[PDB]
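dumping the sequnces here before i forget
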Amino acid sequence: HQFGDDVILDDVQVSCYRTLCSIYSLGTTKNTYVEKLRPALGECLARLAAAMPVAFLEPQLNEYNACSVYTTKSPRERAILGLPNSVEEMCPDIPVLDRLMADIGGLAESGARYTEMPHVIEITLPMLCSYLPRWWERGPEAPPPALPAGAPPPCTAVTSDHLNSLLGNILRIIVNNLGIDEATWMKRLAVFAQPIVSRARPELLHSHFIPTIGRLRKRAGKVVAEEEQLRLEAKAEAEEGELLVRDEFSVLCRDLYALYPLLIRYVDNNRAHWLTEPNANAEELFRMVGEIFIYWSKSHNFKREEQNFVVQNEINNMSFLTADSKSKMARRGDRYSVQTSLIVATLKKMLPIGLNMCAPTDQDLIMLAKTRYALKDTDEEVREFLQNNLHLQGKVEGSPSLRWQMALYRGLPGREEDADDPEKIVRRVQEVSAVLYHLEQTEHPYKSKKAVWHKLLSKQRRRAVV
Amino acid sequence: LLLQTNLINYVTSIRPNIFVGRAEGSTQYGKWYFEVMVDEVVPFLTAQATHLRVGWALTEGYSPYPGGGEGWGGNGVGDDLYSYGFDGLHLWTGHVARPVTSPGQHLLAPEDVVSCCLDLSVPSISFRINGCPVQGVFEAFNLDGLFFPVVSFSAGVKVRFLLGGRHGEFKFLPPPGYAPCHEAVLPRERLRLEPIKEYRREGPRGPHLVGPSRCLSHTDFVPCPVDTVQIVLPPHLERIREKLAENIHELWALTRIEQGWTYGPVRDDNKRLHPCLVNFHSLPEPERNYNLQMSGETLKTLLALGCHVGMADEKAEDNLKKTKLPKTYMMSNGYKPAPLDLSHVRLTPAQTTLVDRLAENGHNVWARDRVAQGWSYSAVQDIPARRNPRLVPYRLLDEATKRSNRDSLCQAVRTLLGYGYNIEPPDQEPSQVENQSRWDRVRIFRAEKSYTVQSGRWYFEFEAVTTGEMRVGWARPELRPDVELGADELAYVFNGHRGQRWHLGSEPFGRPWQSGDVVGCMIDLTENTIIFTLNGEVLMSDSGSETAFREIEIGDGFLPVCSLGPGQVGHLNLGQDVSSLRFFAICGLQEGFEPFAINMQRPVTTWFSKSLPQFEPVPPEHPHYEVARMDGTVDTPPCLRLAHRTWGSQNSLVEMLFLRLSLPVQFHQHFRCTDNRDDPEIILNTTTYYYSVRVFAGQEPSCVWVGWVTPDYHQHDMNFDLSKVRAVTVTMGDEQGNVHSSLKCSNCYMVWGGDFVSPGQQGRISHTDLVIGCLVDLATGLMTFTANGKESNTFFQVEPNTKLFPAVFVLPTHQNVIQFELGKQKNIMPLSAAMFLSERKNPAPQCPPRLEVQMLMPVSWSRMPNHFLQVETRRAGERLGWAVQCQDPLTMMALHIPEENRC
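..and the predicted 3d for all of it:
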């Protein structure tokens, strides 16, 4: 409710300063108690950073800030109540913003692990994620009203560059800590980091996202290949190793729920630009998400491992989908459903990129490939089927719809008819066909009356089973 | 009997933003003058003669909508009882042309100059042609609203408004006491030429649909300060008012001195002299007598508001911060002012709002007092004429003066808080303005029913130029114009202003737009869903639902629809040109949705809700009103009875009901020069016809009006009384007075039941039933009324060829309300004979099926013209005035109902 500048003024300011500085000083201590209590302290500190009216990380520019005790109170005041006479002297243990970002970048490039940087992940990063956004609005690069902008200098110096660097480094960290068996900090880091993704620059995709999703997709492929081999060999020894591939599935799901909530927002901000000006990087990301969704649809273990992760960690996924509405401020089936699943949600979000890949005339070929996938032909098989059945490709003169669709297709800047080549058509068509097929299979599972547990006999006769 | 067809030209009306009227306590002047100079006129650019009329029109009621209307269309000045015009040869009012005599009498031609004069006291409207008198006048007309200059024209015209001063140079001197109309431009606005009640305009990308326009009222100019007549002041406030007067005079002195004024033995505007500056006591008794009452009014208002003022701290009075004007500074007094220094004093926003309201009241009190003296408003200041650019209530006041008064009074409050008197702000008290009617507020635009889609995926866009009340979505072909979108099941819409989704009620959904935003409305009839997007972003409910509505039933189908409130502007793109769709590619194209008009050669035809009341048959299934056709007996004649179905029940609808009979009686073209058995020769040679209305016991006659209405009655007034009836008098005399004719025109001829109710101190309810009879002679144009067989004093005279419908206006107070009795008195024929040629000579009363009760409905659907007249408005120069030009013709085929005289 933006109450901070009116509530946290002089003595509340001092109390919040003390709380902030104590929680930060707690980082050096190492104890089992600290390990358990650090998350709550980090959340409290993040909310405090979001509420505070002053920029404790940027003290040098305090004089411009008006909601500060140093400005509101005379120097003769702040003597009766113990003050150091300097915002810097308030509590130096907190470093400046630049120093913290340099540290975080060093940790990320080094490959530091949660054991070496537990304080950062659980306290500092949330605090920055709540600090930077607030000060971006009140600092330069913000939408300036004429008079308010022209007169007082902005106290904060935060720009979108800070947020982009922080987001890259946070990723950058997750990828260093991907394989680990136990990572509970990932889900909290994601929820704290989501807000700063709106300012994310386009280059972040190629720089960070593509390798991450590629590594996860490769791991998923290895896991499903294992599962296939374990199937192939059918024993009690096959039941053994099922738990191993299970654990691989669970860690994969954990990493996915860590990374995706950020990607969804980055996608949401850049769908318009990706659809207006075609982007090969976006198309590659689409291929990746489609492959992951195909693996999800094919493997039963992966789906239920995902369900288990969500229910056990009490992930809502409501927040990930609707943080746009949240910033707006305006039973088990709901508690978790496939439509909630981040995998399918991301796939649906990026599918229009896939359709933009495809020419409207290719739609018929897409339908044929989608029926072949229902026949359970392989990817190469549908590829060659499209290759030899290319003649079927649609003809615009027959139907007016294709005419106005071609109009826009050519209207796309980067698209030219020379770029289109039979390999391109077959590859894109079968990709989108597989995606669409598995999408309909997910949407209409036909789960109805399969494994009924309405227990009508025992409900009508409960006494007799007892 | 058969519908008639003819080709008619489109007509358009243009006015300056000049609005003048008469009201008690009004700050406005009464007499006004303007001129129109014709430059080019094409007599016949089409088969129909060119239309050019100049005159005055009333803000409330003059709604000439493009296309069809009264008579054969071409509605302009003088085609209704709200407008008064002159074409060069005739005076126009009530869609009737009455010849008027002028030297060199001719139809408006190039180089002609028409001088129009309005006196609101008489009231009277007069004209001069090329400086020559026009021997006719409009008078005795309604003053319910504000009058503005207006010109109605067809294609083939160039004209110039001359309003006075810089905005136009008069060619003929205005008559004494008649102010130029340029003096009426309000401080906040600037003079301009605008259309009247437009629902459509052009804009960069395309047409913009426009909602209703907020308009002023004659009462708004009347200042209405809070009542203070019971002026009681606590003693501590009686002493301090004079000190407040001294200090405000002191602050006035500061304003003058920093403005550069100097000590003045005599006050004068240009000289920069003010006798007030000199000292707090030396300041003259006239100014004290002026401003002491003002301080008293301020204190009494503080009391009225409920604020409690008392001596909170004697120390504040005893000791106070002594402000010191810089010793360097110098003034003509020689005596440095000392207002209370109050940098250590904080006034809260509540007190700021109270300051605003008190400044409003102070300005309004000044205005009422100065008006009582006799001053008036004028954009140009004239003291001898007693005209000021500030005799206008605070709301219309300019921001500069608003700020000046606000600051002065805020410092007054600051001085009071320095005195330390406590300030208790009153609790906020909400109120409802009720500026416009329910129907006059909202305008609905929908696609034509023929474009109904029962299948597929469809997309369209609605750009909001404003951030106010607008709703956009999909509607069923039976959407009622009167109902607000989404209140019923007929529409599924989105209202961004509050972020709501409407269908059978309001639910939160989506976020408000900002100016320039585009809402994409999508309908999928395969999946039976409706989707809304904002700037390419799919709006979501307060949940994970990506769809506003689900489980829709296709049924008859769906149509694109929008509604605009007052002051609202939208742009509806249905996709005829896909390239113009900004957000289709981002959302919808890949999803498979198609533009609504993707492959249509012509733009989608639209219909709009028109708030022009028209008479329609009572639906048989109307929940609240029933009409029973009674067959005639030996003792009783044929009858039509009205019954309230929901009387004495919760959900009962009790509102004034306007009813007529479907068929009129027409007066002859030429009027003649000048034991209860009908005598055959009398009853066959008579030209008199009769009907009656029975008000049943329990229905208050005071809530009943009985008589006739012309086919131009369009007034749906909940608070109806006979004074609201439109009226005008056209008076024609020779060159020098000697009025040779005076004709009274009105749409409504009625008598009030109160006039026949005997005065009773008690026992107003009567077991008896009141039988009001109405008689009309179709050869003398005479209309008479009877109460219960006793002749009423009321009588009307109407011109030949007049069409009159039997009408009853009633406020129901009983289950059984009224009974049309289509019977006869002795030697008087029934209405059937007049209505039907076959029965001209049939004395037998009868009620054929065509005769039916019609009820006034406020709103009706109307087709939007595909093309609109292109009018060029400009300011030619200071001398030349403002210029209006229309050169390109437009024609429409008109279907004319003879009995209703509408097209």
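The interface with chain B takes residues 268, 271-272, 275-276, 318, 321-322, 324-325, 328, 330, 339-340, 351-352, 355-356, 400-401, 404, 407-408, 411 of chain A (CB under 8 Å).
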